Ligand binder design. Structure first.
Ligand SMILES: CC(C)(Oc1ccc(C(=O)c2ccc(Cl)cc2)cc1)C(=O)O
Ligand SMILES: CC(C)(Oc1ccc(C(=O)c2ccc(Cl)cc2)cc1)C(=O)O
Ligand SMILES: CC(C)(Oc1ccc(C(=O)c2ccc(Cl)cc2)cc1)C(=O)O
Lengths: 269, 11
């Protein structure tokens, strides 16, 4: 079945992806997992009282005492998420650059690739910070409960719920950072994003990422065959939630956002 | 469009 030939590179690929992955992002899944269980204490926001007291105890990077904050928790929260998304786009861009061969793609296609993959890999990586009760925030300094989010007014309460539903099923796969490094790499190099004009060199890379992932999944998960196909089917699900997130943006929008994000959502799908 | 993104790839 499986041999030990020049698959040494496949493993060389995964090591390289892991090493830049672990320094590209703040909180690895390993680290967040330890916080979600104890060994290491975030402030828990379950309450409007805990909210109002959370913004006091937690040091959010996007806020400064001198600036005007909207009297509107739903809006003060969207603010932080926008700031974090802007930062996440930059961290994902840096990671994309470390994927062997990416920087030699046509720069117009690197842009297209990053445009469609960012939020998918954002939702993928968000699960690493979630359990069934809530999600870690502020580099693990805070913890916002799932049920408090759902209680926010009007449509904002419907933003994070699909993400929780995704994370629950997705975390049951019990992937680790080493697996996550190669999976997001496979996401970024999706050769079926709309608007690509030099596909073949992208597919060639994705295949190398795909077979490196499969080999990684067999070596690291003896207790579950078909983990590979299950992940691929997850990439299908990540697209649907993006489609469902945009429609929600529209609802709110017809009732703004950082030029980088507006740049990303403009003419998406 | 994609000028902010295009700029980040150029680094
Ligand atoms: C930032 C932007 C453009 O749009 C988002 C809008 C909302 C969320 C939330 O998760 C959220 C949930 C509840 C509240 Cl009250 C506030 C925010 C995340 C992203 C994106 O897609 O990058
Ligand atoms: C890379 C990643 C996943 O970056 C994030 C980017 C965007 C968000 C959000 O959209 C969000 C939604 C709800 C809340 Cl309460 C807070 C943030 C979260 C994390 C990380 O940090 O590992
Ligand atoms: C980079 C990071 C994690 O970005 C945030 C993303 C989301 C939030 C929130 O979920 C939130 C909760 C309550 C309030 Cl009042 C405001 C914002 C905060 C910060 C930060 O800045 O540390």
């Amino acid at each position: 079945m499986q041999l030990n030939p020049e698959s040494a590179d496949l493993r060389a690929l995964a090591k390289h992806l892991y090493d830049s992955y672990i320094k590209s992002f703040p909180l690895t899944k390993a680290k967040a997992r330890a916080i979600l269980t104890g060994k290491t204490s975030p402030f828990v926001i379950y309450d409007m009282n805990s909210l109002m007291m959370g913004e006091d105890k937690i040091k959010f990077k996007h806020i400064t005492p001198l600036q005007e904050q909207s009297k509107e928790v739903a809006i003060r929260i969207f603010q932080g998420c926008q700031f974090r998304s802007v930062e996440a786009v930059q961290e994902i861009t840096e990671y994309a650059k470390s994927i062997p061969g990416f920087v030699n793609l046509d720069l117009n296609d690197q842009v297209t690739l990053l445009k469609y993959g960012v939020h998918e890999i954002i939702y993928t990586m968000l699960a690493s910070l979630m359990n069934k009760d809530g999600v870690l925030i502020s580099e693990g300094q805070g913890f916002m409960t799932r049920e408090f989010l759902k209680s926010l007014r009007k449509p904002f309460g419907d933003f994070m719920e699909p993400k929780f539903e995704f994370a629950v099923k997705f975390n049951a796969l019990e992937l680790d950072d080493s697996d996550l490094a190669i999976f997001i790499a496979v996401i970024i190099l999706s050769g079926d994003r709309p608007g690509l004009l030099n596909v073949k060199p992208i597919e060639d890379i994705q295949d190398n990422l795909l077979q490196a992932l499969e080999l990684q999944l067999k070596l690291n998960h003896p207790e579950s065959s078909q983990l590979f196909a299950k992940l691929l089917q997850k990439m299908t699900d990540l697209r649907q939630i993006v489609t469902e997130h945009v429609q929600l943006l529209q609802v709110i929008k017809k009732t703004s956002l950082h030029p980088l994000l507006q740049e990303i959502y403009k003419d998406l799908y | 469009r994609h000028k902010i993104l295009h700029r980040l790839l150029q680094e």
